[PDB]
Amino acid sequence: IIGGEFTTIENQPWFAAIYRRVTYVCGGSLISPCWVISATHCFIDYPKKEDYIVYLGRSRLNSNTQGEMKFEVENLILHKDYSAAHHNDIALLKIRSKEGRCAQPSRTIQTIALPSMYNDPQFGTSCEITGFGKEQSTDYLYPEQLKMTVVKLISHRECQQPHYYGSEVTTKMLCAADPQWKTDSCQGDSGGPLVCSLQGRMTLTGIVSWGRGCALKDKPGVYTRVSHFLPWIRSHTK
């Protein structure tokens, strides 16, 4: 996350940290006790379950947070109509601990609700993104602390402009950005939550998916339009 501020898991009790062996991979969003939704592109190269470690209630990248839970990946469901721009960038991780249980709601652990089907906030709305991604594009390292910021929804017409992202953007993706392009998601923030308060309720509007650079003029971050995948989400979590 470029710019923004630092935070703790208490401000995104649903955000998940996914590792692999052990290095960070991507973020995730706990949408229910046993289910974490993230982005496919994050796992396509090592599509195997046995390698992933998921954490909930974790506020730091390489040190523990009092109260976090560690989970294995019972199942790694990747969308079948993927290419990557990146299409159907949506993944589902079934989580189970060595004790066999799913996630237990706590002060630093809670689930996030999905939107009403095909229902998205109007463009210009302020949503918040969360993650352990670079603070700057030249950084080699990722921040040790969890960060977050706010970005506004860009209409599909604006993001389609050849001088924006052209045809690469589809009705199934949302664009979001800072009017001055100073804050934004960056490498390391993929999969995680694009939360907007809609209808007066916090909802998972998108999943950090892709973008040309980080905080560059006319180059919004792109997010998987969650509201266009509920039957997929519903069927695959059954």
- Chain contacts with ligand 2BS (rule: CB under 6 A): 185-187, 189-190, 208, 210-211, 214, 221
Distance of closest approach, residue 213 Cβ to ligand 2BS, in angstroms: 6
Distance of closest approach, residue 217 Cβ to ligand 2BS, in angstroms: 14
Question: Which lies closer to ligand 2BS via its Cβ, residue 45 or residue 99?
Answer: 45
Region of residue 167 (left: phi > 0; alpha: psi -120 to 50; beta: else): alpha
- Residue 89 is among the residues annotated as catalytic for this protein: yes
Beta bridge partners of 221: 176
Nearest to 17 by CA among 50, 64, 49: 64
Question: Which lies closer to ligand 2BS via its Cβ, residue 146 or residue 214?
Answer: 214
Among residues 87, 89, 189, 236, the one annotated as catalytic is 89
Question: Which lies closer to ligand 2BS via its Cβ, residue 185 or residue 203?
Answer: 185
Distance of closest approach, residue 149 Cβ to ligand 2BS, in angstroms: 11
Distance of closest approach, residue 127 Cβ to ligand 2BS, in angstroms: 12
Judging by beta carbons within 10 Å of its beta carbon (0-12, 13-18, 19+), is residue 65 exposed, middle or buried? Answer: middle
Q: Any idea what the Cα angle at residue 76 is, between residues 74 and 77, rounded to 5°? A: 130
Q: Where are the beta strands (DSSP E) in 58-198?
A: 69-78, 91-96, 126-131, 147-154, 173-177, 193-198
What single letter denotes the amino acid at residue 56?
L
- Residue 41 is among the residues annotated as catalytic for this protein: yes
Among residues 29, 190, 209, 227, the one annotated as catalytic is 190
Question: Which lies closer to ligand 2BS via its Cβ, residue 14 or residue 142?
Answer: 142
CA distances from residue 34 to 43, 110, 186, 199 in whole angstroms, order as listed? 19, 11, 28, 26
Distance of closest approach, residue 131 Cβ to ligand 2BS, in angstroms: 9
Question: Which lies closer to ligand 2BS via its Cβ, residue 57 or residue 131?
Answer: 131
Q: List helix spans (H) across the chain.
A: 156-160, 230-237
8 Å CB contact between 224 and 90: yes
Q: Residues with catalytic annotation?
A: 41, 89, 190
